[PDB]
């Protein structure tokens, strides 16, 4: 859908991520909005403008929401739900000492529940990670830019061998067979629990990315987090199985979730 950059007021300054700049807004004089002004040359506009209807249509409480787009000019905008607390990733480093590990599993339902829901509607994220997740003035843990990787122009994101690739939080098939399914979502989001439950820490760190993809290719897997309990370390390394077809569904890691949910 369509917005009015009219109906736009820029008011703060995001940082900056894939596709270049991003700010703080408001829709209407009302609405907290994010805006992504999308450098020119970093995506394949033509391919995500042709086929951004059903990412506008994906709807859910634990996705941070595409509201719509500007197309009329350049550069483009995205304009996307705002949360104030910004990227899970610093928010678990910079509050690492006052989480209650209840509270680390609530960010996992959360998570689990946005995946449930793409999973449901045969949608793919693709870079599942807690960079990736946003966190809201409530702590609520949403999913965020789910399906944009494959509109990325950057070498060094798009091959498996870039920088920038995410290898840390991808399964075998895909390092060797760029073989992307909703089981390659699972492996991430089992990595992406670690990252909760060890408070933001690096997967694998100290390793680089080839050495990664070395190790996991032969069986390596990351260690229990001291905050997680055996239940919970069963759930995420059943993310982790080499075979994608043993892997679980997310409507399944979600039933496991909510089981331990319960006996605590
Ligand atoms: C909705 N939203 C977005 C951002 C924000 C800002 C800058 N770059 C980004 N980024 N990162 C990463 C990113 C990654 C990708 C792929 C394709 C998956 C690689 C695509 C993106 F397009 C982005 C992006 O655009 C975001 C994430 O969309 C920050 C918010 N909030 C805050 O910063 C609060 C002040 C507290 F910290 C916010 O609410």
């Given at each position: 859908?369509?917005?009015?950059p ?18 703080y ?32 249509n ?29 990227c ?6 910079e ?8 509270q ?52 060094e ?42 408070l ?19 069986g ?45």
């Open positions: 859908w369509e917005i009015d009219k109906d736009l007021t820029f008011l703060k300054e995001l940082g900056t991520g894939q596709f270049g700049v991003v700010k807004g408001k829709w209407r004089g009302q609405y907290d909005v994010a805006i992504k002004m999308i450098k020119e040359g970093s995506m394949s506009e033509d391919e995500f403008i042709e086929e951004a209807k059903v990412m506008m994906l709807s859910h409480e634990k996705l941070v929401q595409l509201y719509g787009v500007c197309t009329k000019q350049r550069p483009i905008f995205i304009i996307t739900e705002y949360m104030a607390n910004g899970l990733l610093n928010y678990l480093r509050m690492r000492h006052r989480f209650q590990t209840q680390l599993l609530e960010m996992c339902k959360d998570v689990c529940e946005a995946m449930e829901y793409l999973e449901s509607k045969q949608f793919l994220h693709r870079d599942l990670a807690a960079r990736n997740c946003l966190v809201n003035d409530q702590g609520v843990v949403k999913v965020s830019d789910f399906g944009l990787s494959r509109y990325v122009l950057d070498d994101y798009t091959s498996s061998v870039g920088s920038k690739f995410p290898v840390r939080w991808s399964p075998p098939e895909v390092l060797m067979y760029s073989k992307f399914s909703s089981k390659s979502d699972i492996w991430a989001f089992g990595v992406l629990m670690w990252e909760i439950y060890s933001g820490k690096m997967p694998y760190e100290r390793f680089t990315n080839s050495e990664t993809a070395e190790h996991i290719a032969q390596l897997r990351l260690y229990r987090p001291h905050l997680a309990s055996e239940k919970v370390y069963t759930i995420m390394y059943s993310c982790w199985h080499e075979k994608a077809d043993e892997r679980p569904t997310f409507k399944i890691l979600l039933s496991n979730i909510l089981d331990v949910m319960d006996e605590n």
